[PDB]
Design a protein around this ligand. Sequence first.
Ligand code: HEM
Ligand code: HEM
Ligand SMILES: Cc1cc(N)nc(C[C@@H]2CNC[C@@H]2OCCNC[C@H](F)c2cccc(F)c2)c1
Ligand SMILES: Cc1cc(N)nc(C[C@@H]2CNC[C@@H]2OCCNC[C@H](F)c2cccc(F)c2)c1
Ligand SMILES: C[C@H](O)[C@H](O)[C@H]1CNc2nc(N)[nH]c(=O)c2N1
Ligand SMILES: C[C@H](O)[C@H](O)[C@H]1CNc2nc(N)[nH]c(=O)c2N1
Ligand SMILES: [Zn+2]
Lengths: 404, 402
Amino acid sequence: GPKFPRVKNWELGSITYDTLCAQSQQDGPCTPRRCLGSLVLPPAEQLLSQARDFINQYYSSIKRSGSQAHEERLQEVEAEVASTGTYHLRESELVFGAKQAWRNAPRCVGRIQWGKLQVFDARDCSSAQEMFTYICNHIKYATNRGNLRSAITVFPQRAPGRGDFRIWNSQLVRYAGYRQQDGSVRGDPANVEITELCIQHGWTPGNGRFDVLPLLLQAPDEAPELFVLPPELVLEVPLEHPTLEWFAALGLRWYALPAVSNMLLEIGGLEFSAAPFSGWYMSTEIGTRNLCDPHRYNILEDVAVCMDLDTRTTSSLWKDKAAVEINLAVLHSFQLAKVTIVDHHAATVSFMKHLDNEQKARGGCPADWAWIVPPISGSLTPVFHQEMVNYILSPAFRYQPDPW
Amino acid sequence: KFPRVKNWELGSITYDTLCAQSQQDGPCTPRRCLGSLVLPPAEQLLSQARDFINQYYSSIKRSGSQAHEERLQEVEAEVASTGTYHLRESELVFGAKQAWRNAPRCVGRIQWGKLQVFDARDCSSAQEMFTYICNHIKYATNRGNLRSAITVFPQRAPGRGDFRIWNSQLVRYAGYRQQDGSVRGDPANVEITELCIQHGWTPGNGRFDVLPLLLQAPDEAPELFVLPPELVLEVPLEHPTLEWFAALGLRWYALPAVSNMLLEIGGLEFSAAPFSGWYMSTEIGTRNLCDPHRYNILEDVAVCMDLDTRTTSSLWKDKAAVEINLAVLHSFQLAKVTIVDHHAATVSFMKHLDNEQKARGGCPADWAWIVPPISGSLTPVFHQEMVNYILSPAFRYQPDPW
Ligand code: HEM
Ligand code: HEM
Ligand SMILES: Cc1cc(N)nc(C[C@@H]2CNC[C@@H]2OCCNC[C@H](F)c2cccc(F)c2)c1
Ligand SMILES: Cc1cc(N)nc(C[C@@H]2CNC[C@@H]2OCCNC[C@H](F)c2cccc(F)c2)c1
Ligand SMILES: C[C@H](O)[C@H](O)[C@H]1CNc2nc(N)[nH]c(=O)c2N1
Ligand SMILES: C[C@H](O)[C@H](O)[C@H]1CNc2nc(N)[nH]c(=O)c2N1
Ligand SMILES: [Zn+2]
């Protein structure tokens, strides 16, 4: 074979070679001396080359590469940068770039849907209040009464010497976490800081386990402003189990819409610091991570006690049994409420199909094995047996640290 | 420089300084991570030897002593004269424990200091290899109270062919290709099964037929030896509450004993150095029995359980897999054969990480192999960042001798 990584599937015995990785223009965290693949967090000339690359990508995607229109677009970007230090994307370039950032996201198992993204252009937005309107519109469109639709809303890009548009919440919908007297947390321990920041900015807190947080929205050079989401906009699913009738009595619930709001969207060197996007859940993120992580709702022991399991010994597999029934409750309850969700089996099957599609279309697919393999039943899914190459392509979504 | 390593469940952070001791490159580069891939003169030999002898004298806290100086000179003298050298038994013992300590894919490393090392470097024939292997099996098995062991056969030499065990483990079950392209037994072992038959083995026809060994002395065809049945401890699988489970006729062998890896110590290479510990239950219950390309029993079990098999969203696979893992643990516990479940194994691995942080400043670990194949995030290792790199002494994969 060629001098590109050989990639094997150990279940089926099949082999491919990744040639797409040659397109990577940004270094990850590994060296020949040590692999850091498991870590969670790993100028005019600089901008212009990122821009040219992106414009080349766009004209390739419309098959007008080398054309007069292509060359004129490049010259227009260069002159814009020459005189202003920055440039602006055409509407169709933004749409292409946003779908490409999703396509490029190594940690996303849902990429078979990448071409079906509704891109809302909010680059005219000039205030926190207007961000709120755009965000409520996104939530209404995306939620679609339970028939969820993938979407992204793009606020204005970072600009020379002017502050950023930022949504302070890590997602559009999250539950509060309230630090208690005895040191415990009521609600979601992941959200203790943001919850405290909201109270500080004038929110009157609740006292429940599942209280929806308000949004803290920041327009350039202003303190963030607080906006409560009208409860009729936030679709939630009370959790019940198909055969364990007591499960409904636990009063657990989750919201319908997974909407990430703290990632930076980079396209051609331009940085969109507020560009919240949403899809639909894969059930394990709720049933396994949100509900069972020891540092989250941590409900395994409660549920195992209800199931009458022996929680005194590891080898009864009480944690495994309880996690499975909680995951089944999530799926059953979303299906009952007619809210789009995908189980880990169906999601990883569709990601294997996406891998094949991309092998044909671009000669590989950047993928992060530790994130793509689900957190229960790993080797029961086809992705566990599939070698994966991880690398950074642009356009991309990047993590940004909390603005506080 | 030194990477920061975070645990996301507890918020705790360490810095890995051990990785600076790596002298051998892995498959990653700044352009792309290949961490998920399964497969990767006299002066170079001399410096590996020196490093190793330095490691050894450091472990017995005699660095710089007279014995240390004179041993270094012995190695130099031997290499300069002959191109190679030989380890003393106590060095071999230290080196074997260290290759285990260093193995990034092993979750069982809390046990690394406890290893019985059989010196088989005076072995000159496949016959003698067989006797040594039978003794290792008897020792390691110990009527079910398993004891970690390694037997080390003669090192590679520039002149000649290697000592090799053709089998990938000392105990494995045959896989017989059928006329309909079906496999009876373990589909992972079709090739070795067919090799045994072509070297004169009379095959069984069951699902759990223990394979004979193909053992190879230098520059000879391999020879076939059948393991005496009484040496091979097996565990019938039954379930604590599902009565019909026992009637599936399932079983697994007690002793996991890897026989195809190369042991590298101080630049010397031991191409046959089979080692054994005890099983982590998910290896049997999840991979061997539920992999689609292995015994693939999930659907049969789920149907016996009367689960709805038609749709993924009933989580019938997840349910059946849990019960199969439970059957494995219950049955080994019942037979009084050492086994460890994935929760206990991963908790002890976390302690090993803390011990190693204190002892050496880090611990090379391969997250994709450390995290178990069921209930990943239910175990503490899922939430633990890991740094992967190659330290020597080391175990290395070697391709099949045919
Ligand atoms: C259509 C349904 C979708 C499904 C089922 C899905 C599935 C997932 C899952 C399970 C994860 C891992 C999340 C975690 O553990 O934190 C993930 C990550 C991610 N997905 Fe998707 N995805 C979907 C849509 C989207 C969309 C619309 C975008 C953007 C346009 C997106 C981009 C990303 C990114 C950037 C990550 C990494 C997040 C991070 O680093 O925290 N995905 N996806
Ligand atoms: C004491 C009981 C032990 C337990 C519970 C244990 C656990 C494990 C597990 C679960 C794996 C992954 C197996 C797989 O998925 O193929 C593994 C791999 C490995 N272990 Fe251990 N281990 C034990 C003892 C040992 C010993 C005694 C040695 C050598 C002296 C050793 C060296 C290795 C090596 C080199 C690998 C990687 C094997 C490969 O690449 O195929 N371990 N261990
Ligand atoms: C520190 C840090 C880095 C990073 N890259 N990421 C994070 C968010 C963490 C990752 N793991 C839990 C939490 O992220 C929770 C949010 N995940 C929802 C998911 F991204 C999703 C699902 C379906 C559709 C869709 F559009 C989006 C934190
Ligand atoms: C191609 C290739 C490369 C590589 N490094 N490795 C392999 C063996 C594979 C790994 N995954 C299944 C199979 O290896 C099965 C052997 N595993 C037994 C396990 F290693 C074990 C457990 C407890 C104690 C002990 F001493 C040994 C194949
Ligand atoms: C340490 C490790 O990288 C970390 O816990 C990762 C593992 N895999 C994951 N996979 C997904 N999809 N989401 C996550 O939050 C994590 N956490
Ligand atoms: C492709 C992927 O690396 C491969 O399936 C790995 C993943 N993790 C593993 N983990 C262990 N312990 N054993 C294995 O064989 C594997 N296989
Ligand atoms: Zn890597």
